[PDB]
Coordinates of C-alpha atoms in Angstrom, one line a residue:
Chain A
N1378 CA 63.2 92.9 92.7
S1379 CA 64.2 94.9 96.0
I1380 CA 67.0 93.6 98.1
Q1381 CA 66.9 95.2 101.5
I1382 CA 70.3 95.4 103.1
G1383 CA 72.0 97.1 106.5
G1384 CA 73.7 100.0 106.6
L1385 CA 76.3 100.6 110.1
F1386 CA 78.0 103.9 109.5
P1387 CA 79.6 105.5 112.7
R1388 CA 78.6 108.8 113.1
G1389 CA 81.3 110.9 111.7
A1390 CA 81.7 108.4 108.3
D1391 CA 80.8 111.6 105.8
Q1392 CA 83.2 110.5 103.0
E1393 CA 82.3 106.6 103.9
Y1394 CA 78.7 107.2 103.4
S1395 CA 79.2 109.6 100.5
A1396 CA 81.1 106.6 98.2
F1397 CA 79.0 104.2 99.3
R1398 CA 75.9 106.6 98.0
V1399 CA 78.2 107.0 94.8
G1400 CA 78.2 102.9 94.6
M1401 CA 74.3 102.7 94.9
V1402 CA 74.4 104.8 91.8
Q1403 CA 77.6 103.7 89.8
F1404 CA 75.9 99.7 90.4
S1405 CA 72.6 100.2 89.7
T1406 CA 70.5 98.0 87.0
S1407 CA 67.1 97.4 86.3
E1408 CA 67.3 93.5 87.0
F1409 CA 67.3 94.4 91.1
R1410 CA 67.8 97.8 93.2
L1411 CA 69.4 97.7 96.5
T1412 CA 67.7 98.9 99.5
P1413 CA 70.0 100.4 102.3
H1414 CA 68.6 101.1 105.7
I1415 CA 71.2 103.3 107.4
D1416 CA 71.8 103.6 111.4
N1417 CA 74.2 106.0 112.5
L1418 CA 75.2 104.6 115.9
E1419 CA 78.7 104.7 117.9
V1420 CA 80.1 101.8 116.4
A1421 CA 82.6 101.3 119.9
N1422 CA 79.4 101.2 121.7
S1423 CA 78.6 97.6 121.9
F1424 CA 75.3 97.4 123.0
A1425 CA 74.3 100.4 120.4
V1426 CA 75.9 97.7 117.6
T1427 CA 73.9 95.0 119.2
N1428 CA 70.4 96.8 118.7
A1429 CA 71.6 98.1 115.3
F1430 CA 72.1 94.4 113.9
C1431 CA 69.0 93.0 115.9
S1432 CA 66.8 95.9 114.4
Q1433 CA 68.1 95.4 110.9
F1434 CA 67.3 91.8 111.4
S1435 CA 63.7 92.1 112.6
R1436 CA 63.8 94.4 109.3
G1437 CA 64.2 90.9 107.6
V1438 CA 67.5 92.2 105.5
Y1439 CA 69.6 89.8 103.4
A1440 CA 73.0 91.4 104.2
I1441 CA 74.9 93.9 106.2
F1442 CA 77.3 96.4 105.3
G1443 CA 79.2 98.6 108.2
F1444 CA 81.8 98.9 110.3
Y1445 CA 83.4 97.8 114.0
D1446 CA 85.6 98.8 116.5
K1447 CA 88.1 96.7 118.5
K1448 CA 85.7 96.6 121.4
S1449 CA 82.5 95.2 119.3
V1450 CA 84.2 93.1 116.7
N1451 CA 83.3 90.3 118.5
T1452 CA 79.8 91.3 118.8
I1453 CA 79.2 91.7 115.0
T1454 CA 81.2 88.0 114.1
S1455 CA 79.4 86.4 117.0
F1456 CA 75.8 87.2 115.6
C1457 CA 76.1 86.9 112.3
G1458 CA 77.9 83.7 112.5
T1459 CA 74.8 82.5 114.8
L1460 CA 72.5 83.9 112.4
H1461 CA 74.1 83.1 109.4
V1462 CA 73.9 86.8 108.6
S1463 CA 76.4 88.5 106.0
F1464 CA 78.3 91.1 107.1
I1465 CA 80.5 93.1 105.0
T1466 CA 83.1 95.5 106.4
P1467 CA 86.1 97.8 105.5
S1468 CA 87.4 98.2 108.8
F1469 CA 90.3 95.6 109.6
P1470 CA 90.3 92.1 109.1
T1471 CA 89.4 90.0 112.1
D1472 CA 92.0 88.1 113.8
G1473 CA 90.9 84.2 113.0
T1474 CA 88.6 82.4 111.3
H1475 CA 85.2 84.1 111.6
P1476 CA 82.4 82.8 108.9
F1477 CA 79.7 85.0 107.5
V1478 CA 82.0 88.2 107.0
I1479 CA 83.5 89.6 104.5
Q1480 CA 86.3 92.1 104.8
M1481 CA 87.4 94.6 102.3
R1482 CA 91.0 95.6 104.4
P1483 CA 93.5 93.2 102.9
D1484 CA 95.9 92.3 105.7
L1485 CA 99.0 94.8 105.9
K1486 CA 100.9 92.4 108.5
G1487 CA 102.9 90.7 105.6
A1488 CA 103.7 94.0 103.7
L1489 CA 104.6 95.6 106.2
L1490 CA 107.5 92.7 107.6
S1491 CA 108.5 92.6 104.1
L1492 CA 109.4 96.2 104.1
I1493 CA 111.7 96.1 107.4
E1494 CA 113.6 93.3 105.5
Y1495 CA 113.8 95.5 102.7
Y1496 CA 115.6 98.6 104.0
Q1497 CA 117.4 96.0 106.4
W1498 CA 116.3 97.0 109.8
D1499 CA 117.2 95.5 113.0
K1500 CA 116.6 98.4 115.8
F1501 CA 113.5 100.6 115.1
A1502 CA 110.6 102.1 117.5
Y1503 CA 106.9 101.1 116.9
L1504 CA 104.0 103.1 117.9
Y1505 CA 101.4 101.4 118.0
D1506 CA 97.3 102.5 118.5
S1507 CA 95.3 99.6 119.9
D1508 CA 92.5 100.9 117.8
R1509 CA 93.0 98.0 115.1
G1510 CA 94.2 95.3 117.6
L1511 CA 97.8 94.1 118.3
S1512 CA 97.2 92.0 115.7
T1513 CA 100.4 93.3 113.3
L1514 CA 102.0 94.4 116.7
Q1515 CA 102.3 90.6 117.6
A1516 CA 103.6 90.2 114.2
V1517 CA 106.5 92.4 114.5
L1518 CA 107.1 90.9 118.1
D1519 CA 107.4 87.5 117.4
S1520 CA 109.1 88.2 113.9
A1521 CA 111.8 90.2 116.2
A1522 CA 112.5 86.6 117.5
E1523 CA 112.9 84.8 114.6
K1524 CA 114.5 87.9 112.4
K1525 CA 116.4 89.2 116.3
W1526 CA 115.0 92.5 116.1
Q1527 CA 115.4 95.2 119.4
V1528 CA 112.0 96.5 119.0
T1529 CA 110.7 99.6 121.0
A1530 CA 107.1 99.2 121.4
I1531 CA 104.9 101.8 122.4
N1532 CA 101.4 102.1 122.6
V1533 CA 101.0 105.9 121.4
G1534 CA 97.2 105.3 121.9
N1535 CA 96.3 105.8 125.6
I1536 CA 97.6 109.3 125.3
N1537 CA 95.1 111.9 126.7
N1538 CA 94.7 114.4 124.4
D1539 CA 93.4 117.3 126.9
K1540 CA 97.7 117.6 127.5
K1541 CA 99.2 115.5 125.2
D1542 CA 102.5 117.3 124.8
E1543 CA 104.5 116.6 127.8
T1544 CA 103.6 112.7 127.0
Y1545 CA 105.3 113.4 123.5
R1546 CA 108.2 115.1 125.2
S1547 CA 108.5 111.9 127.7
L1548 CA 108.5 109.8 124.7
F1549 CA 110.9 110.8 122.5
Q1550 CA 113.0 111.3 125.7
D1551 CA 112.9 107.5 125.5
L1552 CA 113.4 107.0 121.9
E1553 CA 116.5 109.1 122.5
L1554 CA 118.2 106.3 125.3
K1555 CA 119.2 104.3 122.1
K1556 CA 119.0 107.1 119.7
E1557 CA 116.0 105.6 117.9
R1558 CA 116.0 106.8 114.3
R1559 CA 113.9 104.6 112.8
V1560 CA 109.9 104.3 113.7
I1561 CA 107.1 103.0 112.6
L1562 CA 103.7 104.2 112.8
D1563 CA 100.9 102.1 112.8
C1564 CA 98.1 104.4 113.7
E1565 CA 94.9 106.0 111.9
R1566 CA 95.1 108.9 109.6
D1567 CA 94.2 111.1 112.2
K1568 CA 97.2 109.8 115.1
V1569 CA 99.3 110.1 112.3
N1570 CA 99.3 113.9 111.5
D1571 CA 99.2 114.4 115.1
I1572 CA 102.7 112.7 115.3
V1573 CA 104.1 114.2 112.3
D1574 CA 103.1 117.3 113.7
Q1575 CA 104.8 117.0 117.0
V1576 CA 108.0 115.2 114.9
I1577 CA 108.6 118.5 113.0
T1578 CA 107.8 120.5 115.9
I1579 CA 110.9 119.0 117.9
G1580 CA 112.4 118.7 114.6
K1581 CA 113.2 114.8 113.9
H1582 CA 112.0 115.2 110.4
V1583 CA 115.4 116.2 109.3
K1584 CA 117.8 114.1 107.8
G1585 CA 118.5 110.9 109.4
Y1586 CA 115.3 110.1 110.6
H1587 CA 112.9 107.2 108.9
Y1588 CA 109.6 106.8 109.6
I1589 CA 107.1 104.1 108.4
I1590 CA 103.3 104.8 107.9
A1591 CA 101.5 101.3 108.6
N1592 CA 98.2 101.7 106.9
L1593 CA 96.5 101.4 103.6
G1594 CA 96.7 105.5 103.4
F1595 CA 99.6 106.7 102.7
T1596 CA 98.2 109.6 100.5
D1597 CA 95.3 110.2 102.4
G1598 CA 97.2 112.5 104.8
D1599 CA 99.1 115.3 104.5
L1600 CA 102.5 114.6 103.8
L1601 CA 103.7 118.6 102.5
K1602 CA 105.0 119.4 106.2
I1603 CA 107.5 116.1 106.5
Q1604 CA 108.0 116.4 102.6
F1605 CA 111.0 118.6 102.9
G1606 CA 112.5 118.2 106.1
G1607 CA 115.0 115.6 104.9
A1608 CA 113.8 112.5 106.6
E1609 CA 113.0 109.9 104.4
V1610 CA 109.2 108.8 104.6
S1611 CA 107.6 105.2 103.5
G1612 CA 104.4 103.6 103.4
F1613 CA 101.6 101.9 101.7
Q1614 CA 98.8 102.7 99.3
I1615 CA 96.2 100.7 98.3
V1616 CA 94.4 102.9 95.8
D1617 CA 96.3 103.1 92.5
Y1618 CA 95.6 106.2 91.2
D1619 CA 97.6 105.2 88.5
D1620 CA 94.6 102.6 87.1
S1621 CA 92.7 104.2 84.5
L1622 CA 89.7 102.8 86.3
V1623 CA 90.2 104.7 89.7
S1624 CA 91.8 108.1 87.5
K1625 CA 88.2 107.8 86.2
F1626 CA 86.3 107.2 89.3
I1627 CA 88.5 110.8 90.4
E1628 CA 87.5 112.7 87.2
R1629 CA 83.8 112.4 88.5
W1630 CA 84.4 112.0 92.1
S1631 CA 86.4 115.0 92.1
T1632 CA 83.6 117.3 90.6
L1633 CA 80.6 116.1 92.8
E1634 CA 79.2 118.3 95.0
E1635 CA 80.7 118.8 98.3
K1636 CA 77.2 120.0 99.6
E1637 CA 75.5 116.7 98.8
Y1638 CA 78.5 114.6 99.0
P1639 CA 80.1 115.7 102.3
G1640 CA 84.1 115.8 101.8
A1641 CA 83.8 114.2 98.5
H1642 CA 85.0 117.2 96.4
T1643 CA 88.9 116.1 96.0
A1644 CA 91.4 114.3 93.9
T1645 CA 91.8 111.4 96.3
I1646 CA 89.9 108.9 98.5
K1647 CA 90.8 107.6 102.3
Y1648 CA 91.4 103.7 101.8
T1649 CA 88.6 103.3 104.2
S1650 CA 86.0 104.9 101.4
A1651 CA 87.3 103.5 98.7
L1652 CA 86.9 99.9 100.4
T1653 CA 83.5 100.9 101.0
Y1654 CA 82.4 101.6 97.2
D1655 CA 83.9 98.4 96.1
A1656 CA 82.0 96.9 99.0
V1657 CA 79.0 98.3 96.7
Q1658 CA 80.3 96.5 93.6
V1659 CA 81.2 92.7 95.9
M1660 CA 77.5 92.6 97.1
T1661 CA 75.8 93.8 93.6
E1662 CA 77.9 91.2 92.0
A1663 CA 77.1 88.7 94.5
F1664 CA 73.0 89.0 94.6
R1665 CA 73.5 89.0 90.8
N1666 CA 75.2 85.7 90.5
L1667 CA 72.0 84.3 93.1
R1668 CA 69.5 85.5 90.4
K1669 CA 71.7 84.2 86.9
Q1670 CA 72.4 80.4 89.4
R1671 CA 68.4 80.3 89.5
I1672 CA 68.7 80.7 93.5
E1673 CA 65.5 81.4 95.5
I1674 CA 66.6 83.3 98.7
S1675 CA 63.8 86.0 99.3
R1676 CA 62.1 86.4 102.1
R1677 CA 60.0 89.0 104.5
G1678 CA 60.2 91.5 107.2
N1679 CA 59.6 88.6 109.7
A1680 CA 62.5 87.1 110.7
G1681 CA 61.9 87.6 114.2
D1682 CA 63.2 88.8 117.4
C1683 CA 67.3 87.9 117.1
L1684 CA 67.5 86.9 120.6
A1685 CA 64.8 84.2 119.7
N1686 CA 65.7 81.1 121.5
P1687 CA 66.5 78.3 120.6
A1688 CA 67.9 80.4 117.5
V1689 CA 67.1 79.1 114.1
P1690 CA 69.3 80.1 111.2
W1691 CA 68.0 80.7 107.9
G1692 CA 69.0 78.7 104.8
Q1693 CA 68.8 81.1 102.7
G1694 CA 71.7 82.7 104.4
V1695 CA 74.2 80.0 103.8
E1696 CA 73.8 80.5 100.0
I1697 CA 74.3 84.4 100.3
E1698 CA 78.0 83.9 102.2
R1699 CA 78.8 81.5 99.1
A1700 CA 78.0 84.3 96.5
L1701 CA 79.9 87.1 98.1
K1702 CA 83.0 85.3 98.7
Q1703 CA 82.6 83.8 95.5
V1704 CA 82.8 87.5 93.7
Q1705 CA 85.8 88.6 91.9
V1706 CA 85.7 91.8 90.1
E1707 CA 87.5 94.6 89.7
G1708 CA 87.9 97.9 91.7
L1709 CA 89.7 100.6 93.6
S1710 CA 91.7 98.3 95.5
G1711 CA 93.4 96.5 92.7
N1712 CA 91.7 92.6 91.9
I1713 CA 89.2 91.9 94.5
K1714 CA 89.0 88.0 95.3
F1715 CA 88.1 85.9 98.4
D1716 CA 88.7 82.8 100.1
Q1717 CA 86.4 80.7 101.9
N1718 CA 87.0 82.8 104.9
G1719 CA 86.4 85.9 103.5
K1720 CA 89.9 87.8 104.1
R1721 CA 91.0 89.1 100.3
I1722 CA 93.3 87.2 98.3
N1723 CA 95.4 87.6 94.9
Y1724 CA 95.7 91.6 95.8
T1725 CA 98.3 94.0 95.5
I1726 CA 100.0 96.4 97.8
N1727 CA 101.8 99.4 96.3
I1728 CA 105.2 100.4 98.5
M1729 CA 105.3 104.2 98.5
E1730 CA 108.5 106.4 99.0
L1731 CA 108.3 110.1 99.9
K1732 CA 110.8 111.9 97.5
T1733 CA 111.0 115.9 97.1
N1734 CA 108.8 115.8 94.2
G1735 CA 106.2 113.9 96.1
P1736 CA 105.3 110.4 96.8
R1737 CA 106.6 107.5 94.6
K1738 CA 105.6 103.9 94.1
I1739 CA 108.9 101.8 94.3
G1740 CA 107.5 98.4 93.9
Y1741 CA 104.2 96.6 95.5
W1742 CA 103.6 93.8 97.1
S1743 CA 102.1 90.6 96.4
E1744 CA 101.0 87.4 99.2
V1745 CA 102.6 85.1 96.8
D1746 CA 105.2 87.1 95.5
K1747 CA 106.4 89.4 98.4
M1748 CA 108.0 92.6 97.6
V1749 CA 108.9 93.3 94.0
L1750 CA 110.4 96.4 93.4
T1751 CA 109.9 98.0 90.4
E1752 CA 113.0 99.7 88.3
Chain B
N350 CA 63.1 87.4 151.7
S351 CA 63.6 85.8 148.3
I352 CA 66.6 87.5 146.2
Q353 CA 67.3 85.9 142.7
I354 CA 70.2 86.6 141.0
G355 CA 71.7 85.1 137.7
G356 CA 74.7 82.8 137.4
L357 CA 76.7 82.6 134.0
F358 CA 79.4 79.6 134.3
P359 CA 81.3 78.9 131.4
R360 CA 81.0 74.7 130.9
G361 CA 84.2 73.2 132.6
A362 CA 83.8 75.5 135.5
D363 CA 83.2 72.6 138.1
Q364 CA 85.4 73.8 141.4
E365 CA 84.1 77.3 140.8
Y366 CA 80.3 75.9 140.9
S367 CA 81.1 74.0 143.6
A368 CA 83.0 76.8 146.0
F369 CA 79.6 78.6 144.2
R370 CA 77.6 76.3 145.9
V371 CA 79.5 75.9 149.5
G372 CA 79.5 79.5 149.3
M373 CA 75.6 79.5 149.4
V374 CA 75.7 77.1 152.6
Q375 CA 78.1 79.3 154.4
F376 CA 76.7 82.5 154.2
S377 CA 73.2 81.5 154.3
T378 CA 70.8 83.4 156.5
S379 CA 67.1 83.7 157.7
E380 CA 66.6 87.5 157.1
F381 CA 67.2 86.5 153.4
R382 CA 68.1 83.7 150.9
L383 CA 69.9 84.2 147.6
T384 CA 68.1 82.4 144.7
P385 CA 70.8 81.4 141.9
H386 CA 69.4 80.7 138.2
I387 CA 72.2 79.0 136.7
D388 CA 73.2 78.9 133.0
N389 CA 76.2 76.6 131.6
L390 CA 76.9 78.7 128.1
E391 CA 80.1 78.9 126.1
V392 CA 81.3 81.9 127.7
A393 CA 83.5 82.9 124.6
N394 CA 80.5 82.9 122.4
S395 CA 79.5 86.7 122.2
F396 CA 76.1 85.7 120.7
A397 CA 75.2 83.2 123.7
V398 CA 76.5 85.5 126.2
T399 CA 74.0 88.4 125.0
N400 CA 71.2 85.7 125.2
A401 CA 72.1 84.2 128.7
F402 CA 72.2 88.6 130.0
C403 CA 68.6 89.1 128.5
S404 CA 67.1 86.0 130.0
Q405 CA 68.4 86.2 133.6
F406 CA 67.5 90.2 132.9
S407 CA 63.6 89.3 131.7
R408 CA 63.2 86.9 134.7
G409 CA 64.0 89.7 137.1
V410 CA 67.2 89.2 139.0
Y411 CA 68.8 91.9 141.6
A412 CA 72.3 91.1 140.1
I413 CA 74.4 88.9 138.2
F414 CA 77.6 86.8 139.0
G415 CA 79.4 85.1 135.9
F416 CA 82.9 85.0 133.9
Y417 CA 83.6 86.3 130.3
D418 CA 86.1 86.0 128.1
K419 CA 88.3 88.3 125.9
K420 CA 85.8 88.6 123.6
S421 CA 82.4 88.7 125.3
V422 CA 83.9 90.8 128.2
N423 CA 82.3 94.1 126.0
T424 CA 79.4 92.7 126.1
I425 CA 78.9 92.2 129.5
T426 CA 80.4 95.7 130.6
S427 CA 78.1 97.3 127.9
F428 CA 74.8 96.0 128.8
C429 CA 75.7 96.2 132.3
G430 CA 76.7 99.7 132.1
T431 CA 73.3 100.3 130.3
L432 CA 70.7 98.3 132.0
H433 CA 72.2 99.3 135.3
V434 CA 72.8 95.8 136.0
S435 CA 75.6 94.8 138.6
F436 CA 78.1 91.9 137.3
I437 CA 80.5 90.3 140.1
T438 CA 83.2 88.4 138.1
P439 CA 86.6 86.6 139.0
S440 CA 87.7 86.8 135.4
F441 CA 90.3 89.2 134.8
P442 CA 89.7 93.4 135.6
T443 CA 88.5 95.4 132.7
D444 CA 90.9 97.6 131.0
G445 CA 89.5 100.8 132.1
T446 CA 86.6 102.1 134.5
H447 CA 83.2 100.3 133.2
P448 CA 80.5 100.9 136.2
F449 CA 78.2 98.3 137.1
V450 CA 80.6 96.0 137.3
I451 CA 82.7 93.7 140.8
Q452 CA 86.0 92.3 140.3
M453 CA 87.0 89.7 142.3
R454 CA 90.6 89.7 140.6
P455 CA 92.8 91.9 142.0
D456 CA 95.3 93.6 139.4
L457 CA 98.6 91.4 139.0
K458 CA 100.2 94.2 136.4
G459 CA 101.6 96.1 139.7
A460 CA 103.0 93.3 141.4
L461 CA 104.5 91.8 138.7
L462 CA 106.9 94.6 137.6
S463 CA 107.7 95.2 140.9
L464 CA 108.9 91.4 141.2
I465 CA 111.1 91.8 137.6
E466 CA 113.2 94.9 139.6
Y467 CA 113.5 93.1 142.7
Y468 CA 115.5 90.5 140.5
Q469 CA 117.2 93.2 138.5
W470 CA 116.0 92.1 135.3
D471 CA 117.3 93.9 132.5
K472 CA 116.6 91.0 129.2
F473 CA 113.9 88.6 130.1
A474 CA 111.5 85.9 127.4
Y475 CA 107.9 87.4 127.6
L476 CA 105.6 84.1 126.8
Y477 CA 102.1 85.5 127.3
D478 CA 98.3 84.3 126.1
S479 CA 96.2 87.0 124.6
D480 CA 93.5 85.3 126.9
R481 CA 93.3 87.6 129.5
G482 CA 93.8 90.4 127.3
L483 CA 97.5 92.3 126.4
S484 CA 96.7 94.4 129.4
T485 CA 100.0 93.1 131.2
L486 CA 101.6 92.6 127.9
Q487 CA 101.5 96.4 127.6
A488 CA 102.3 97.0 130.9
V489 CA 106.0 95.2 130.6
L490 CA 106.2 96.6 127.1
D491 CA 106.1 100.4 128.3
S492 CA 108.1 99.9 131.4
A493 CA 110.1 98.6 129.2
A494 CA 110.9 102.0 127.2
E495 CA 111.0 103.6 130.9
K496 CA 113.1 101.0 132.7
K497 CA 115.0 100.0 129.9
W498 CA 114.2 96.7 129.5
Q499 CA 115.1 94.0 126.4
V500 CA 111.6 92.1 126.2
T501 CA 111.3 89.5 123.9
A502 CA 107.6 88.9 123.9
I503 CA 106.1 85.7 122.0
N504 CA 102.3 85.0 121.7
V505 CA 102.1 81.4 123.1
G506 CA 98.6 81.3 122.4
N507 CA 98.1 81.0 118.9
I508 CA 99.6 77.3 118.9
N509 CA 97.8 74.3 117.7
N510 CA 97.6 71.7 120.0
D511 CA 97.2 69.1 117.9
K512 CA 100.8 69.4 116.4
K513 CA 102.0 71.6 118.8
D514 CA 105.9 70.4 119.1
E515 CA 107.6 71.5 116.3
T516 CA 106.5 75.3 117.4
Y517 CA 107.9 74.7 120.9
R518 CA 111.4 73.8 119.3
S519 CA 111.2 76.5 117.1
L520 CA 110.4 78.4 120.2
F521 CA 113.3 78.1 122.8
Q522 CA 115.2 78.0 119.3
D523 CA 114.7 81.6 119.2
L524 CA 115.1 81.9 122.7
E525 CA 118.3 80.7 122.2
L526 CA 119.9 83.4 119.9
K527 CA 120.3 85.6 122.7
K528 CA 120.4 82.5 125.0
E529 CA 117.4 83.8 127.4
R530 CA 117.7 82.0 130.7
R531 CA 115.0 84.4 132.7
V532 CA 111.2 83.4 131.3
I533 CA 108.0 85.0 132.2
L534 CA 104.9 83.0 132.2
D535 CA 101.8 84.7 131.5
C536 CA 99.2 81.8 130.8
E537 CA 96.4 80.0 132.3
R538 CA 96.9 77.3 134.7

C-alpha cells in the first residue's frame, strides 16, 4: 500500500521538514506507507506555487501538505477547491470557509481578545505584521468599537530592514504622544525578536510596560533578554511541554543528530514545526480510517494536466476530505479535532506570563469556556 | 495588421464591456485593428482566472485587458511578471511595484488623506470594505498615528446580506458610544 502525497516546503523550513521526517518515522505502519514528494519553492511566489501544485497533481497525489503566504493562499484554496484536492497546512487559518483545506493552526483571535479583557485594557498599541493577514487586526478593531477601546494600530511590517532604526525611533515617538505603556506584538517569531531587541535598547522594557506576544509560540523566542527588565510580558503557548506526550517527544527530539535533522537538537520546538508533526499523524489516521471503512480511492499518476478544461474533479477526493476532517487524535498541540470546513475545534491554548524564574502558565483558553485561570 | 488581445470581463460588467466596445469603435484605424478575445469568468475565483490567462496566452495574445479581485490579483501580477505579458486593468492599484501591469485607476489614498485635513477631522468613523484591499485602511491608520486621529475602523464587508439589519442597528450603536458624527464610507458603488 503506497500512498503518494505532496509536500510544499518553503525554502528555510528546516525544523518544519525535520519534524515532518520524524513524523513519517513515528507514524509508519506495515498496513501502508506514505510517499512524500518534496518541492522546495518560494511560498510567496504565487506562480511557483501554481506549478508545484499542478506538478504534484500530475504525479497523481491523494493529498498535499504545505504552506502558503498572504499572497499565495488564494491560489491554494482555489485550486484545491476546484480539483477536490485536500490540502493540509500548519499556516495561518483561512479567512472564511474554504473546502478541501485542513488547518493545523487554531484561531488565536479569540484567545487574544479574552486576554485583553482579563488585564482590563482600554488603551493599547497594536503593532501588527501583514504577513499572516489582517484577520486579527480587524478582530481587535471591530471589538474596539463594542468594548470601546482606543487602539493605536501600526503596521510594523513594511519597515525596510537595511536602515530600520530611524523608523523604530519614530515609532515609539508616536507611542509616547499618548504615553502608550501597553503594546501588543502581532508578528512572527523573527519580527518579534527584532522589536524586543529595540525595546531593550531604548529601555522601554522596564517596570510600567506590558507586552503581549500575539502568537502560538510564546516560548519559541528568546525571552531571557526582556525577562529581567521589569516590564510584564504575556503570550500564548500551544505546545504544552508539561504533557507526558510532548515531554516524551522532546526526549527523543533533543537527542536527534542536528546534522541529519537541521535545528532539531533543542529542548523546545516552534509551534509551526509541532503542527507539521501533528499533520503527519492526522494524514495517517485519515488514510487508515479509509482502509478500515472499505473505501477504494486508489488511482495512478495520470490525473492529467490541472489546467484541463473542462476541469473534472475526481470523486475519490470527496472521501479523502471526509476522512481527514473526521480524524481525532492526541498530538503535541493538544486535542486535535475538526469541523466540516477544516478549522480546528475543541482545542486548548495556554495563557502564559513571563516572571522572574521564567515563563509560567496562568491558565488556558477554550473555544467554549473562554479564559480559565489555574490557581 | 491584426493584433490579438485578451479580455477578462467579470460576469456582470455590462457597462464596462459596453464602454469597451465603444472604445474599439472610436479608436479603430486602418493602420491596424484590435481583435478582442472575450472571456467571461468569475473574477473572484483564482483557479478560473488562471485558466482564462493561460487560454488567452496559448491563443498567442500581445496584451491582456481585464479585472482582478483582492483574491485573484496575486495570480495576475505573478503570471504577467513571469511570462512578460502586459496586463491593463481599471481595477484597484496593486499594493507594490508589480511589472507588466498597467493600472487605469489612480491612487485615491492621497486625495482622501488631504480631504480629511481640509475639514480638520480629528475623530471619525471609517467603514471599510475588504474588496479593494486594506491599502487605504492602512493609510488612514498609519496617518492616525502621526496626525493623531481617533479612527473607529469597522469592516462593513463581512455583513451577511440575508439578515443584514440587526447588524447595522448594532453598527450605529457603537458609533453612538462616542457620538460619531463624521463617517468615511470606503466601499463600492
